[PDB]
């Protein structure tokens, strides 16, 4: 929603929405590395047990809400995606982000 600052660049909902799209069953990793508790990854798998798309979505956008204020936001995501073994996705984000 409101990710990043003017200097680094911003992340639109459409963008974040695109990340959620490129994530699969490895969502829990990106979430753990993003520092979400395991207890919570589980809790989300429950609240949306029949819909993967929503869990991947709710995880992101909720962490997004959390970090709504923070600066290093977009930085933490990229790092987490790197560590979750998705250089793949880390580079798209770094790219779109390219504008500040």
């Amino acid at each position: 929603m409101n990710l990043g600052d003017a200097e680094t660049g911003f992340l639109t909902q459409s963008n974040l929405l695109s990340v959620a799209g490129r994530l699969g069953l490895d969502w829990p990793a990106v979430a753990l590395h993003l520092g979400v508790s395991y207890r919570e990854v589980q809790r989300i798998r429950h609240e949306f047990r029949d819909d993967l798309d929503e869990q991947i979505r709710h995880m992101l956008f909720s962490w997004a809400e959390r970090q709504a204020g923070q600066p290093g936001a977009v930085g933490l995501l990229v790092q987490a995606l790197e560590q979750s073994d998705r250089q793949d996705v880390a580079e798209e984000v770094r790219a779109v982000l390219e504008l500040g």
Partner: protein, 91 residues
């Protein structure tokens, strides 16, 4: 003729029933990604029938008009499987 239309909720369910191990390689050459598939699989753990349908519902909802039986025909062929399958579930 029907060759340029779109399988319906019931017709898909039919196609799904008869497809096996290659339902995955098929939906890939149709336009789905490996990520779509994990969603099907995940959204329907126990039960492959339900998975293969979501797989096709996605593919029809993604390419709307362009999701013809023609497309399916090629796919089946592409994934090494008798293209007549469409003939049998259309009677």
């Amino acid at each position: 003729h029907i060759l340029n239309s779109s399988p319906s909720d019931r017709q898909i369910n039919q196609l799904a029933q008869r497809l096996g191990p290659e339902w995955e390689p098929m939906v890939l050459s149709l336009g789905l990604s490996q990520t779509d598939i994990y969603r099907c699989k995940a959204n329907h753990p126990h039960n492959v029938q339900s998975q293969v349908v979501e797989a096709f519902i996605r593919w029809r909802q993604r390419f709307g008009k362009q999701a013809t039986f023609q497309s399916l025909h090629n796919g089946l062929r592409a994934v090494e499987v008798d293209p007549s399958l469409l003939l049998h579930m259309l009677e």
